[PDB]
């Protein structure tokens, strides 16, 4: 249908801190690690539907500037003595036809799960710190 967004990228904020230095070129990405329901399927038109406990478990890959307030926050999170839970939201504003709706996706208790692969070059500039915060519930609503 007809649709247009404000807010170029999904504005994002974890722990009441908003990410504002996002590496241009598809920084955020949400990946469902698992299915939403596994099934066992028996003879003659019979199946069994069971929503797994890993339903919303989503990994969020974030790309941030090599040394930025956003990378400072994520790094201080990474180096904490006790791994810091992450709660927050990814959301966009968008006007459906004329009506203004907001598409939000909560992000429950999550944590670091892959450190950035810290690469420094000389040929070419590279400021690409990619964290992956993988939560358990990522419910989009709209």
């Amino acid at each position: 249908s007809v649709i247009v967004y404000r807010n170029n990228q999904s504005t994002l904020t974890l722990n009441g801190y908003t990410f504002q230095h996002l590496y241009q070129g598809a920084a955020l990405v949400l990946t469902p690690v698992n299915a939403k329901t596994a099934r066992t399927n028996s003879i003659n038109g019979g199946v069994s539907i069971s929503g797994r406990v890993d339903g919303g478990v989503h990994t969020l890959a974030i790309m941030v500037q090599k040394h930025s307030p956003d990378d400072k926050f994520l790094n201080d999170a990474k180096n904490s003595q006790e791994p810091v839970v992450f709660d927050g939201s990814m959301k966009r504003a968008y006007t459906e036809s004329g009506t203004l709706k907001k598409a939000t996706t909560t992000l429950e208790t999550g944590s670091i799960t892959t450190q950035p692969t810290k690469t420094d070059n000389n040929q070419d500039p590279d400021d690409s710190r990619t964290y992956v915060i993988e939560f358990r519930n990522s419910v989009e609503t709209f």
């Binding site: 007809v2 247009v4 967004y5 404000r6 807010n7 170029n8 990228q9 241009q24 006007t95």
Partner: peptide, 21 residues
């Protein structure tokens, strides 16, 4: 392009606006 002013003035312009590439 990615400030308040832009993102606030492109209200009814039925047109998203991506980052300068």
């Amino acid at each position: 392009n990615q400030s308040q002013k832009a993102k606030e003035v492109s209200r009814g312009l039925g047109l998203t606006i991506y980052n300068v590439s």
